[PDB]
Write a protein that binds this ligand. Structure first.
Ligand SMILES: [Ca+2]
Ligand SMILES: [Ca+2]
Ligand SMILES: [Ca+2]
Ligand SMILES: [Ca+2]
Ligand SMILES: [Zn+2]
Length: 316
């Protein structure tokens, strides 16, 4: 890890050419010394033991298919770091510039990715349902945002708190996708999901019910699956967030869109200054309204739009 900072070149999961920050001692390692205490990408070698080996390359050129997921994990972790620093003035996930670690090639045909409490972990997918998940930018940002949440609001992963947690992750994932301006959309996971099927995705913020998730509180999942539906009920918060930014009419309730940036500022403020581990949807509403009030003033259009948006999804 002690070495000379330099720049390598490679190809990502989708075949796009990419420059990446690397470190050289006797080998070129994926270690980025330009951001905080650094970004480290590891090879899990198809096994489940973590983190694995710090990625080492001989020529500082990663064009091998085996290389592709490491390139994107390393790179997109950088973009996400840049996002929080430049937009939100936050240094890494803990605010202290903690090192960011990612392991790729996790297990075999593993169709998920996650934050394990320490590092990010990415599967390669089975090549049918998924391709390597580090290929999506919103996925990377989604997982990385879990750390941010873990270090600030500490939303428990279960029931409504959990749903909020997931929603935050999707929201900021999407915002990062827009920030990097790489084929941005309000869909989640569209780049790495189901190769061979065009136009679909894992979740939709604009229209969750497309994939069977609730767009309204009365439609919320009350069962015990998925930790009480953290990946399901998130649709309700996701829809509200979409409406705040883009505006629209939902179940007869109209919302004036205030844009992405203000959405981001409002929700980041709610996340950092207000939400607690046990916060529910109502409390989230309160937090967001208070945040918007803090930033733009109580009589502002912004507050009004937050209100309208949460009214639309039936969260009072
Ligand atoms: Ca090489
Ligand atoms: Ca996209
Ligand atoms: Ca997306
Ligand atoms: Ca697809
Ligand atoms: Zn998540």
């Amino acid at each position: 890890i002690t070495g000379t900072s330099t720049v390598g070149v490679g190809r990502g999961v989708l075949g796009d050419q990419k420059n990446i920050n690397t470190t050289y001692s006797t080998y070129y390692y994926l270690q980025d010394n330009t951001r905080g205490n650094g970004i480290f990408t590891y090879d899990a070698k198809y096994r489940t033991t973590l983190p694995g080996s710090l990625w080492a390359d001989a020529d500082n050129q990663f064009f091998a298919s085996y290389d592709a997921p490491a390139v994107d994990a390393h790179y997109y972790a950088g973009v996400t770091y840049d996002y929080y620093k430049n937009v939100h003035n936050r240094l890494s996930y803990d605010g202290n510039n903690a090192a960011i670690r990612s392991s790729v090639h996790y297990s075999q045909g593993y169709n998920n990715a996650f934050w394990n409490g320490s590092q990010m972990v990415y599967g390669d997918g089975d090549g049918q349902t998924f391709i390597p998940l580090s290929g999506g930018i919103d996925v990377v940002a989604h997982e990385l945002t879990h750390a941010v949440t873990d270090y600030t609001a500490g939303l428990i992963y279960q029931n409504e708190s959990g749903a909020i947690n997931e929603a935050i992750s999707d929201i900021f994932g999407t915002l990062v996708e827009f920030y990097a301006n790489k084929n941005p959309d309000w869909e989640i996971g569209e780049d790495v999901y189901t190769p061979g099927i065009s136009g679909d995705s894992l979740r939709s913020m604009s229209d969750p019910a497309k994939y069977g998730d609730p767009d309204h509180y009365s439609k919320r999942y009350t069962g015990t699956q998925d930790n009480g539906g953290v990946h399901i009920n998130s649709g309700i918060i996701n829809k509200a967030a979409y409406l705040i930014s883009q505006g629209g009419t939902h179940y007869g309730v109209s919302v004036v869109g205030i844009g992405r940036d203000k959405l981001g500022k409002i929700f980041y403020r709610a996340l950092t200054q207000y939400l607690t581990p046990t916060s529910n949807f109502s409390q989230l509403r309160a937090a967001a309204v208070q945040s918007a009030t803090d930033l733009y003033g109580s009589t502002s259009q912004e507050v009004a739009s937050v209100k309208q948006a949460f009214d639309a999804v039936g969260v009072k």
